[PDB]
Amino acid sequence: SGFRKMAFPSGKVEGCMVQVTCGTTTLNGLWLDDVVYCPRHVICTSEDMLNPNYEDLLIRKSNHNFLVQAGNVQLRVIGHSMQNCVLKLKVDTANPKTPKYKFVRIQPGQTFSVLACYNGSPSGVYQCAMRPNFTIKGSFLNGSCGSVGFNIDYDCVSFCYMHHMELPTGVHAGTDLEGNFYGPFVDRQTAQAAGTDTTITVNVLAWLYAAVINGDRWFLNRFTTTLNDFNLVAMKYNYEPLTQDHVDILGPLSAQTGIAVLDMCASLKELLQNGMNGRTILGSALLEDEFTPFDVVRQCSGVTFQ
Amino acid sequence: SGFRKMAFPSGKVEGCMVQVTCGTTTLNGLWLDDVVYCPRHVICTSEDMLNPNYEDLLIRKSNHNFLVQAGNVQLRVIGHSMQNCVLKLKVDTANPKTPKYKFVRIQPGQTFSVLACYNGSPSGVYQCAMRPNFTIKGSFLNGSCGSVGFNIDYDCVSFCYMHHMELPTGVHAGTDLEGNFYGPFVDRQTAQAAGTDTTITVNVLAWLYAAVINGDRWFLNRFTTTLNDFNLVAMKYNYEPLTQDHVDILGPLSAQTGIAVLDMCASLKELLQNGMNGRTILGSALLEDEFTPFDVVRQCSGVTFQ
Ligand SMILES: *[C@H](O)[C@H](C[C@@H]1CCNC1=O)NC(=O)[C@H](CC(=C)C)NC(=O)[C@@H](NC(=O)OCc1ccccc1)C(C)C
Ligand SMILES: *[C@H](O)[C@H](C[C@@H]1CCNC1=O)NC(=O)[C@H](CC(=C)C)NC(=O)[C@@H](NC(=O)OCc1ccccc1)C(C)C
């Protein structure tokens, strides 16, 4: 037993990370087959950030401007193209460590692992969620751009995020691997606003089931509620609406623990209205919302990968 | 910015993980050079757990009893020996993915990354700390034994933990890689007791500095304290004593933020005596103690590895 915020093993992604340097900007790229993917703002100097024209900057670049570097070995760039907010650098060598992969776009409320990199070298791995406002609460310092987020499903890496920028509240914004931003953000350093966030209700319920599976039961009761009456409380506490689909998705956890979904909703209502009264749940004094129902099932049945 | 519980990239360890099956027990092993390391209780059936004699069981075993399996490839065991609570299986093939490594034993209060594995396949990676009572609060299901904990320092993997068992409070116990248990635990399934734990004071202070670096300042004050007066409060709240060595170790973080260590102690005193009053620090409503001063510096300066 136990419950931890657990990332996927990162080896498959480590073998794809390279360093991309152009001008005086250095950042990370993702090397799959004979293409290196990276944030297009690499073609920008410090005076460029404030109002850039990326098509302008890119026609003025040439292949030899891009210094791509895989560990020690130099990668010769033989072509370049822009796709939305990502740059695709064609190199003359296919990455022999290329995993089975897919480019997927995730939904707010879903989780993924981030491999934080600097100068093409991995620094650390952690888990997070795409927030309802399309930001992520990451840990990124300057030079981390081009680090990616991903999920793994047996042997296949589903890349879902590439890091581009930090917003004023210290949260982070980026694109899918087709270069399309998550949320209403642009890769310019003009004033931009994260937007009001909400708590991911279905994930909080999943985590309450994780707690019951692990022996925390003090928040349980036999009050029950209707879905409509629960959603009235959700709205008041800035939680998102729970749908019948969410209830269905929680079915297996409900079946495992013998606690009906609407009964767990009544527990969450009381926790919202009363607080935790100095107690903890899975070592937290807050209601945690960055574990999906899949994350709970995965961790409490021991699914593996390779 | 941001602050996450961040593990080391796990690729170097993934390439060492194998499956060890003997009798009807299956667990994980660590394949370095031509040796596979695994918990010696693999030589035990279910009736053996309750009072085993491992020297008895091991002389009755032979090499062909041990089924070692690296992904798909079969590893021929050519010798076996016991070292404390670990088994060393000599195989006829050296692991070509063997990293630079060391076997280190860590101190309570130190952190490491765990690569949780089942059937020799990595499932997830997470960070934790060795508790003052020599347990770890892990996430381990049945079949996870032989999973290892580690730190990485540039290219060198320092293995510090191998998983053996779960105690009744849902915490975990294991050995260093020389097979010596952390704490007063034995690999028998007789009743065993975790022992009263304490909070790792120096780590809490490190995390408060992480918070200031990241813009949480509401808990700061200009009350100050002496080391002796702080330790009187520590003892009352079941915190461990802060030493002058701990103060010295916090020096760089103190210098970076301009907050004297003893001033941060006065903040922690007020947090202990008053609570957090509905506020959070780095997204937690509890005082977090599983980040070392090194973990904070590493994450807030961006140190990498390969
Ligand atoms: C790429 O390595 C970095 C990563 C960034 C540095 C610190 N933490 C991070 O995640 N990305 C950038 O430097 C980008 C460049 C870009 C194309 C926008 N710039 C930023 O992240 C700045 N953010 C920003 O300009 O957001 C909009 C804004 C909001 C308020 C005032 C002005 C601009 C950030 C470094 C200030
Ligand atoms: C190896 O894969 C497992 C991992 C274990 C299973 C569930 N979570 C885990 O971490 N380890 C074991 O099965 C060991 C075997 C051993 C050599 C002791 N057994 C346990 O972990 C049991 N723990 C135990 O017996 O602790 C002492 C104790 C305490 C109270 C009453 C009886 C015994 C556990 C599965 C019950």
Coordinates of N, CA, C and O in Angstrom, one line a residue, chain A residues 1-12 14 115-119 121-129 136-141 154 166 169-172 280 283-286 290 298-306, chain B residues 1-12 14 115-119 121-129 136-141 154 166 169-172 280 283-286 290 298-306:
Chain A
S1 N 0.8 -1.2 0.0 CA 0.0 0.0 0.0 C 0.9 1.3 0.0 O 2.0 1.2 -0.4
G2 N 0.3 2.4 0.4 CA 0.8 3.7 0.2 C 0.3 4.4 -1.1 O -0.2 3.7 -2.0
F3 N 0.5 5.7 -1.2 CA 0.0 6.5 -2.3 C 0.9 7.6 -2.5 O 1.1 8.5 -1.7
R4 N 1.6 7.7 -3.7 CA 2.5 8.7 -4.0 C 2.2 9.4 -5.3 O 1.5 8.8 -6.2
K5 N 2.7 10.6 -5.5 CA 2.5 11.3 -6.8 C 3.7 10.7 -7.7 O 4.8 11.0 -7.5
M6 N 3.3 9.8 -8.6 CA 4.2 8.9 -9.2 C 4.3 9.2 -10.7 O 3.2 9.3 -11.4
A7 N 5.5 9.4 -11.2 CA 5.7 9.6 -12.7 C 5.9 8.3 -13.4 O 6.2 7.3 -12.8
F8 N 5.8 8.4 -14.7 CA 6.2 7.2 -15.5 C 7.7 7.2 -15.5 O 8.4 8.2 -15.5
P9 N 8.3 6.0 -15.7 CA 9.7 5.8 -15.9 C 10.1 6.6 -17.1 O 9.4 6.6 -18.1
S10 N 11.2 7.3 -17.1 CA 11.5 8.4 -18.1 C 12.6 7.9 -19.1 O 12.9 8.7 -20.0
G11 N 13.1 6.7 -19.0 CA 14.2 6.3 -19.8 C 13.9 6.5 -21.3 O 14.7 7.0 -22.1
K12 N 12.7 6.1 -21.7 CA 12.3 6.2 -23.2 C 12.4 7.6 -23.7 O 12.7 7.9 -24.8
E14 N 14.3 10.1 -22.1 CA 15.7 10.6 -21.9 C 16.5 10.4 -23.2 O 17.3 11.3 -23.6
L115 N 9.5 15.5 -18.0 CA 10.9 15.3 -17.8 C 11.6 16.7 -18.0 O 11.8 17.2 -19.1
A116 N 11.9 17.3 -16.9 CA 12.6 18.6 -16.9 C 14.0 18.5 -17.4 O 14.8 17.8 -16.8
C117 N 14.4 19.3 -18.4 CA 15.7 19.2 -19.0 C 16.3 20.6 -19.1 O 15.6 21.6 -19.2
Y118 N 17.7 20.6 -19.0 CA 18.5 21.8 -19.3 C 19.6 21.4 -20.1 O 20.3 20.4 -19.9
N119 N 19.9 22.2 -21.2 CA 21.0 21.9 -22.1 C 21.0 20.5 -22.7 O 22.0 19.9 -22.9
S121 N 20.1 17.8 -21.2 CA 20.3 16.8 -20.2 C 19.1 16.7 -19.2 O 18.8 17.8 -18.6
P122 N 18.6 15.6 -19.0 CA 17.5 15.5 -18.0 C 17.9 15.8 -16.6 O 18.9 15.3 -16.1
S123 N 17.1 16.6 -15.9 CA 17.3 17.0 -14.5 C 16.4 16.2 -13.5 O 16.9 15.9 -12.4
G124 N 15.2 16.0 -13.9 CA 14.2 15.4 -12.9 C 12.9 15.1 -13.6 O 12.7 15.5 -14.7
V125 N 12.1 14.2 -12.9 CA 10.9 13.8 -13.5 C 9.8 14.1 -12.4 O 10.0 13.8 -11.2
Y126 N 8.7 14.6 -12.8 CA 7.6 14.7 -11.9 C 6.2 14.6 -12.6 O 6.1 14.8 -13.8
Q127 N 5.2 14.5 -11.8 CA 3.8 14.3 -12.4 C 3.1 15.6 -12.2 O 3.2 16.4 -11.3
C128 N 2.2 16.0 -13.2 CA 1.2 17.0 -12.9 C 0.0 16.9 -13.7 O -0.1 15.9 -14.5
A129 N -0.9 17.8 -13.6 CA -2.2 17.8 -14.3 C -2.3 19.0 -15.1 O -1.8 20.1 -14.8
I136 N -0.2 24.6 -16.3 CA 0.2 23.6 -15.5 C 1.1 24.2 -14.4 O 1.7 25.2 -14.5
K137 N 1.0 23.5 -13.2 CA 1.8 24.0 -12.1 C 3.1 23.2 -12.1 O 3.2 22.1 -11.4
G138 N 4.1 23.6 -12.9 CA 5.3 22.9 -13.1 C 6.4 23.4 -12.2 O 6.2 24.2 -11.3
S139 N 7.6 22.9 -12.5 CA 8.8 23.4 -11.9 C 9.8 23.6 -13.0 O 10.4 22.6 -13.5
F140 N 10.0 24.8 -13.4 CA 10.8 25.1 -14.6 C 11.6 26.4 -14.4 O 11.1 27.4 -13.9
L141 N 12.9 26.3 -14.8 CA 13.8 27.4 -14.7 C 14.2 27.8 -16.1 O 13.9 27.1 -17.1
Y154 N 1.8 0.6 -22.3 CA 2.9 -0.4 -22.4 C 4.2 0.2 -22.9 O 5.0 0.6 -22.1
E166 N 6.5 30.8 -18.8 CA 6.1 31.0 -17.4 C 5.2 32.2 -17.3 O 5.6 33.3 -17.8
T169 N 1.9 34.4 -12.3 CA 1.7 33.7 -11.1 C 2.6 32.5 -10.8 O 2.3 31.7 -9.9
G170 N 3.6 32.3 -11.7 CA 4.5 31.2 -11.5 C 4.0 29.8 -12.0 O 4.5 28.8 -11.7
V171 N 2.9 29.9 -12.8 CA 2.5 28.7 -13.5 C 2.9 28.7 -15.0 O 3.5 29.7 -15.4
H172 N 2.7 27.6 -15.7 CA 3.4 27.4 -16.9 C 2.5 27.1 -18.1 O 1.4 26.6 -17.9
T280 N -5.7 14.5 8.4 CA -5.1 14.4 7.1 C -5.7 13.2 6.3 O -6.3 12.3 6.9
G283 N -1.8 11.7 3.9 CA -0.7 12.6 4.2 C -0.9 14.0 3.7 O 0.1 14.8 3.7
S284 N -2.1 14.4 3.3 CA -2.4 15.8 2.9 C -3.4 16.5 3.8 O -4.4 15.8 4.2
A285 N -3.3 17.8 4.0 CA -4.3 18.5 4.7 C -5.2 19.3 3.8 O -6.0 20.1 4.3
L286 N -5.0 19.1 2.5 CA -5.9 19.6 1.4 C -6.5 18.5 0.6 O -6.0 17.4 0.6
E290 N -5.0 16.2 -8.4 CA -4.1 15.9 -9.5 C -3.9 14.4 -9.7 O -2.9 14.0 -10.3
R298 N -4.2 2.5 -11.5 CA -2.9 2.1 -11.9 C -2.0 1.8 -10.7 O -1.3 0.8 -10.6
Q299 N -2.0 2.7 -9.8 CA -1.1 2.7 -8.6 C -1.5 1.6 -7.6 O -0.7 1.0 -7.0
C300 N -2.8 1.4 -7.5 CA -3.4 0.4 -6.6 C -3.8 -0.9 -7.3 O -3.9 -1.9 -6.6
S301 N -3.1 -1.2 -8.4 CA -3.1 -2.6 -9.0 C -1.8 -2.9 -9.6 O -1.5 -4.1 -9.9
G302 N -0.9 -2.0 -9.8 CA 0.5 -2.2 -10.1 C 0.8 -2.4 -11.6 O 1.6 -3.3 -11.9
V303 N 0.1 -1.6 -12.4 CA 0.4 -1.8 -13.9 C 1.8 -1.3 -14.2 O 2.3 -0.3 -13.7
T304 N 2.5 -2.0 -15.1 CA 3.8 -1.8 -15.5 C 4.0 -1.4 -17.0 O 3.0 -1.3 -17.7
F305 N 5.2 -1.2 -17.4 CA 5.5 -0.8 -18.8 C 6.9 -1.3 -19.2 O 7.8 -1.4 -18.4
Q306 N 7.0 -1.4 -20.5 CA 8.3 -1.6 -21.2 C 8.1 -1.9 -22.7 O 8.8 -1.4 -23.6
Chain B
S1 N 10.1 29.1 -12.1 CA 9.8 28.8 -10.8 C 8.9 27.6 -10.6 O 8.7 26.8 -11.6
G2 N 8.2 27.5 -9.5 CA 7.5 26.3 -9.1 C 8.4 25.4 -8.2 O 9.6 25.4 -8.2
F3 N 7.7 24.4 -7.5 CA 8.4 23.5 -6.7 C 7.6 22.2 -6.6 O 6.5 22.2 -6.2
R4 N 8.3 21.1 -7.0 CA 7.6 19.8 -7.1 C 8.4 18.8 -6.4 O 9.6 18.9 -6.3
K5 N 7.8 17.7 -6.0 CA 8.5 16.6 -5.5 C 9.0 15.8 -6.7 O 8.3 15.2 -7.4
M6 N 10.4 15.9 -6.9 CA 10.9 15.6 -8.2 C 11.9 14.4 -8.0 O 12.8 14.5 -7.2
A7 N 11.8 13.4 -8.9 CA 12.7 12.3 -8.8 C 13.8 12.5 -9.8 O 13.7 13.3 -10.7
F8 N 14.8 11.7 -9.7 CA 15.9 11.6 -10.7 C 15.3 10.9 -11.9 O 14.5 10.0 -11.8
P9 N 15.8 11.3 -13.1 CA 15.5 10.5 -14.3 C 15.9 9.0 -14.1 O 17.0 8.8 -13.5
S10 N 15.1 8.1 -14.5 CA 15.2 6.7 -14.1 C 15.8 5.8 -15.1 O 16.0 4.6 -14.8
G11 N 16.1 6.3 -16.3 CA 16.6 5.5 -17.4 C 17.8 4.6 -17.0 O 17.8 3.4 -17.3
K12 N 18.8 5.1 -16.3 CA 20.0 4.4 -15.9 C 19.6 3.2 -15.1 O 20.3 2.1 -15.2
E14 N 16.4 1.8 -15.0 CA 15.5 0.9 -15.8 C 16.3 -0.2 -16.5 O 15.9 -1.4 -16.6
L115 N 12.4 3.5 -8.0 CA 11.8 3.0 -9.2 C 11.0 1.8 -8.9 O 11.5 0.7 -8.7
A116 N 9.7 1.9 -8.8 CA 8.8 0.8 -8.4 C 8.7 -0.1 -9.6 O 8.3 0.3 -10.7
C117 N 8.9 -1.4 -9.4 CA 8.9 -2.4 -10.5 C 8.1 -3.6 -10.1 O 8.0 -3.9 -8.9
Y118 N 7.5 -4.2 -11.1 CA 6.8 -5.5 -10.9 C 7.2 -6.4 -12.1 O 7.3 -6.0 -13.2
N119 N 7.5 -7.7 -11.8 CA 8.0 -8.7 -12.8 C 9.1 -8.2 -13.6 O 9.2 -8.4 -14.8
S121 N 9.7 -5.2 -14.6 CA 9.3 -4.0 -15.5 C 9.0 -2.8 -14.7 O 8.2 -2.9 -13.7
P122 N 9.6 -1.7 -15.0 CA 9.4 -0.5 -14.2 C 7.9 0.0 -14.4 O 7.4 0.1 -15.5
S123 N 7.3 0.4 -13.2 CA 6.0 0.9 -13.2 C 5.9 2.4 -13.0 O 5.0 3.1 -13.6
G124 N 6.8 3.0 -12.2 CA 6.7 4.4 -11.8 C 7.9 4.8 -11.0 O 8.6 4.0 -10.5
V125 N 8.1 6.1 -10.9 CA 9.2 6.7 -10.2 C 8.7 7.7 -9.2 O 7.8 8.5 -9.6
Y126 N 9.2 7.7 -8.0 CA 8.8 8.8 -7.1 C 9.9 9.1 -6.1 O 10.8 8.3 -5.9
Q127 N 9.8 10.2 -5.4 CA 10.8 10.6 -4.5 C 10.3 10.3 -3.0 O 9.1 10.4 -2.7
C128 N 11.2 9.9 -2.2 CA 10.9 10.0 -0.7 C 12.1 10.1 0.2 O 13.2 10.3 -0.3
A129 N 11.8 10.1 1.5 CA 12.9 10.3 2.4 C 13.0 9.1 3.3 O 12.0 8.4 3.6
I136 N 10.3 4.0 5.3 CA 10.0 4.9 4.2 C 8.5 4.9 3.9 O 7.8 3.8 4.1
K137 N 7.9 6.0 3.6 CA 6.5 6.0 3.2 C 6.4 5.9 1.7 O 6.4 6.9 0.9
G138 N 6.4 4.6 1.2 CA 6.5 4.3 -0.2 C 5.1 4.0 -0.8 O 4.1 4.2 -0.1
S139 N 5.2 3.5 -2.0 CA 4.0 3.0 -2.6 C 4.4 1.7 -3.3 O 5.0 1.7 -4.3
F140 N 4.0 0.6 -2.6 CA 4.5 -0.7 -3.0 C 3.4 -1.7 -2.9 O 2.7 -1.8 -1.8
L141 N 3.2 -2.5 -3.9 CA 2.3 -3.6 -3.9 C 3.0 -4.9 -3.9 O 4.2 -5.0 -4.1
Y154 N 26.2 13.5 -11.3 CA 26.3 13.5 -12.8 C 25.9 12.2 -13.4 O 24.8 12.0 -13.8
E166 N 6.5 -4.6 4.0 CA 5.5 -3.6 4.4 C 5.1 -3.8 5.9 O 4.8 -5.0 6.2
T169 N 1.5 -0.3 9.7 CA 1.0 1.0 9.4 C 1.0 1.4 7.9 O 0.8 2.6 7.6
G170 N 1.4 0.5 7.0 CA 1.5 0.8 5.6 C 2.7 1.5 5.2 O 2.8 2.1 4.1
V171 N 3.8 1.5 6.1 CA 5.0 2.0 5.7 C 6.0 0.9 5.4 O 5.6 -0.3 5.6
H172 N 7.1 1.2 4.9 CA 8.0 0.2 4.2 C 9.4 0.1 4.8 O 9.9 1.1 5.3
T280 N -1.7 28.4 2.7 CA -0.9 27.3 2.2 C 0.5 27.8 1.9 O 0.7 29.0 1.7
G283 N 1.7 25.2 -2.0 CA 0.6 24.3 -2.3 C 0.3 23.2 -1.3 O -0.4 22.3 -1.6
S284 N 0.9 23.4 -0.1 CA 0.6 22.4 1.0 C 0.0 23.1 2.2 O 0.4 24.3 2.5
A285 N -0.9 22.4 2.9 CA -1.4 23.0 4.2 C -0.8 22.3 5.4 O -1.2 22.5 6.5
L286 N 0.3 21.6 5.1 CA 1.2 21.0 6.2 C 2.6 21.4 6.0 O 3.0 21.8 4.9
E290 N 10.2 16.4 3.5 CA 10.9 15.4 2.7 C 11.6 16.1 1.5 O 11.9 15.4 0.5
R298 N 19.1 22.1 -5.7 CA 19.1 21.5 -7.0 C 18.0 21.9 -7.8 O 18.2 22.3 -9.0
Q299 N 16.8 22.0 -7.3 CA 15.6 22.3 -8.0 C 15.5 23.8 -8.4 O 15.0 24.2 -9.4
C300 N 16.0 24.6 -7.5 CA 16.1 26.1 -7.7 C 17.4 26.6 -8.2 O 17.4 27.7 -8.8
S301 N 18.1 25.8 -9.0 CA 19.3 26.3 -9.7 C 19.4 25.4 -11.0 O 20.2 25.8 -11.9
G302 N 18.7 24.3 -11.1 CA 18.6 23.5 -12.3 C 19.7 22.6 -12.6 O 20.1 22.5 -13.8
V303 N 20.2 21.9 -11.6 CA 21.3 20.9 -11.9 C 20.8 19.7 -12.7 O 19.7 19.3 -12.4
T304 N 21.6 19.3 -13.6 CA 21.3 18.2 -14.5 C 22.2 17.0 -14.4 O 23.1 17.0 -13.5
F305 N 22.0 16.0 -15.2 CA 22.7 14.7 -15.1 C 22.7 14.0 -16.5 O 21.8 14.2 -17.3
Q306 N 23.8 13.2 -16.7 CA 23.9 12.2 -17.8 C 25.3 11.6 -17.8 O 25.4 10.4 -17.9

